């Protein structure tokens, strides 16, 4: 019924938007992967899964800021692989647990081919992870917007 980031900018129960300040790998290369492990940064939990039986999925993912420019990657949900930006529904991964579990998303952003110069400006938007919350208890199809902001600057080095 809720989702919270590591920085403390938590989304209220009804949904809403908050910032995800993500500490990145300051240099990644083409072929190598910028593994922005949001599984270690944004997490989600349910109020009581005994009757709610929540179903929490990544209904939307968008590339804004630095990632939109060069870094084109793939969203990994529970080990699977989907085209990021997430233009399709992702299969439900429940979080039938009161205790918080680390929201298994991981954007594998391998940058575009050789890109150019400096990429992913510090303090700039990385992505927008719009999460869907559903359950069999009611029709509370609730909206959780994470605006992923880069905490630091990656480079796509020349060579």
């Amino acid at each position: 019924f809720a989702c919270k980031t590591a920085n403390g900018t938590a989304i209220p129960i009804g949904g809403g938007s908050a910032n995800v300040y993500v500490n990145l790998a300051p240099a990644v290369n083409v072929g190598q992967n910028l593994v922005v492990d949001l599984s270690t940064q944004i997490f989600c939990h349910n109020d009581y899964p005994e009757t709610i039986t929540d179903y929490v999925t990544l209904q939307r993912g968008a590339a804004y800021g630095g990632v939109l420019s060069s870094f084109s990657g793939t969203v990994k949900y529970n080990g699977s692989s989907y085209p990021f930006p997430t233009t399709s529904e992702t299969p439900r991964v429940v979080y039938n647990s009161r205790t918080d579990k680390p929201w298994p998303v991981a954007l594998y952003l391998t940058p575009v081919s050789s890109a150019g110069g400096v990429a992913i400006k510090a303090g700039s938007l990385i992505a927008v992870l719009i999460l869907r919350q559903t359950n069999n208890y009611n029709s509370d199809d609730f909206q959780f917007v994470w605006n992923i902001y880069a905490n630091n600057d990656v480079v796509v080095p020349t060579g």
């Epitope: 290369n29 270690t40 510090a122 630091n152 060579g159």
Partner: antibody
Framework: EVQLQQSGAELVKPGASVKLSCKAS????????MHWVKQRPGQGLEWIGL????????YYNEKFKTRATLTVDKSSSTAYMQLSSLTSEDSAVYYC??????????????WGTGTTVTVSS | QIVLTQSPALMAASPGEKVTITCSVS???????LHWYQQKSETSPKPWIY???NLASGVPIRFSGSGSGTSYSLTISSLEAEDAATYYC?????????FGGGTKLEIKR
């Protein structure tokens, strides 16, 4: 612990590029990021740049663009530096390093031996 | 370029004294973006703090950075004599990656 070695304090005339070398074949170059920095006497450090051992891709500083050329030789795991137009403004100790993976951050986890570049005439 | 001004060059402490080596940044950078490196005199440097709060390998528990924004510190609970070295502040917010001018932490005897 596996470390990085470096050349001894070498002599270079003004206008001569050094061949400063940091090498270590015991920690598998195709795993880390192989950075370079510079420390002047009195004046503080100045980040020189980076090259990837896996693919020989470099990113330097604006103050060090067309100043230092950090190369990699991962087969022998050697890294040299080209310093054409080496003036006394570049007379400094020059250090090798690499980014580790400490938590979500990357940082100069292991340093080289260190080598003093003297550009006195 | 990112200006990074510290306590300019001078420091001094006894075996146990606190050293509040400040690191003022021209922009309010996040705690993720700051590093500290220890370089002993005529000796190779060592990573001392990465990410403003997480110490590197071999750095004792006495060192611990803090702060955010444009003010940055390296609070030391008990500085021993062996730690006498120049501590260079580094940013990795932007990519001049401008190191500091370095505070030569000497020893006050």
């Amino acid at each position: 612990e596996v470390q990085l070695q470096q050349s001894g304090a070498e002599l270079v005339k003004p206008g001569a590029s050094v061949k400063l070398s940091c090498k270590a074949s015991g920690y598998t170059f195709t795993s880390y990021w192989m950075h370079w920095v510079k420390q002047r006497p009195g004046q503080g450090l100045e980040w020189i740049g980076l090259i990837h051992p896996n693919s020989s891709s470099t990113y330097y500083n604006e103050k060090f663009k067309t100043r230092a050329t950090l190369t990699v030789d991962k087969s022998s795991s050697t890294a040299y530096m080209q310093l054409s137009s080496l003036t006394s403004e570049d007379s400094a100790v020059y250090y090798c390093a690499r980014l580790g993976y400490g938590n979500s951050y990357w940082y100069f986890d292991v340093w080289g031996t260190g080598t003093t570049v003297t550009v006195s005439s | 370029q990112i200006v990074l001004t510290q306590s300019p060059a001078l420091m001094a402490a006894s075996p146990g004294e606190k050293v509040t080596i400040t690191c003022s940044v021209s922009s309010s950078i996040s705690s993720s973006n700051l590093h500290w490196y220890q370089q002993k005199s005529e000796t190779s440097p060592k990573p001392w703090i990465y990410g403003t709060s997480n110490l590197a390998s071999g750095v004792p528990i006495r060192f611990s950075g803090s702060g955010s924004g444009t003010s940055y510190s390296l609070t030391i609970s008990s500085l021993e004599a062996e730690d006498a070295a120049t501590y260079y502040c580094q940013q990795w917010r932007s990519y001049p990656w401008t190191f500091g001018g370095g505070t030569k932490l000497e020893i006050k005897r």
